[PDB]
Design a protein around this ligand. Structure first.
Ligand code: HEM
Ligand code: 4CH
Length: 137
């Protein structure tokens, strides 16, 4: 289930974080508008940049904290607020997060492993509505 998936991801967090984020960047090319330093580089080129590995892992670490604190795939309003108020998120809308989780769910369903894809789909939608309740446009 969802709780075990958190452990699966956390066990190899750096690799999953890179692969899932790359799946998002490749599914949604216009999304590199928020990532000017990643334009014009292949997946393998990105993985060789130190800040790519570091920043994608720190993103997914916080995502796993928010996932772990969730109740029945419903994130805490306080966690959604944190993600709204982060200065690094100043330009974002909930559409950006919706696409991130569409790509993540797609990645899980295409993987070899027994992810509870439906729960992560619900988590993404519940996070989208929580970001909106916490004031994201
Ligand atoms: C639940 C999902 C997300 C979580 C937990 C999260 C968390 C974080 C964290 C912890 C950082 C700081 C990383 C660091 O610089 O060391 C960060 C930075 C950033 N995030 Fe998010 N984030 C999420 C979704 C998104 C999405 C969907 C976008 C855009 C589509 C985005 C855009 C950015 C940008 C532009 C930065 C600053 C530049 C960079 O670090 O590359 N984030 N995020
Ligand atoms: O540096 C990064 C990496 C992944 C994401 Cl979603 C946002 C910022």
């Amino acid at each position: 289930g969802f709780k075990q998936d958190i452990a699966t991801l956390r066990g190899d967090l750096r690799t999953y974080a890179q692969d899932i984020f790359l799946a998002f960047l490749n599914k949604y090319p216009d999304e590199k508008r928020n990532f000017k330093n990643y334009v014009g580089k292949s997946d393998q080129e990105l993985k060789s940049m130190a800040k790519f590995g570091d920043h994608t892992e720190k993103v997914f670490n916080l995502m796993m904290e928010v996932a772990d604190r969730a109740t029945d795939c419903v994130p805490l309003a306080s966690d959604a607020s944190t993600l709204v108020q982060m200065k690094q998120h100043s330009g974002l809308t909930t559409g950006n997060f919706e696409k991130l989780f569409v790509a993540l769910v797609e990645y899980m369903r295409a993987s070899g492993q027994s992810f509870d894809s439906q729960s992560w789909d619900r988590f993404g939608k519940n996070l989208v509505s929580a970001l909106s309740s916490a004031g994201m446009k």
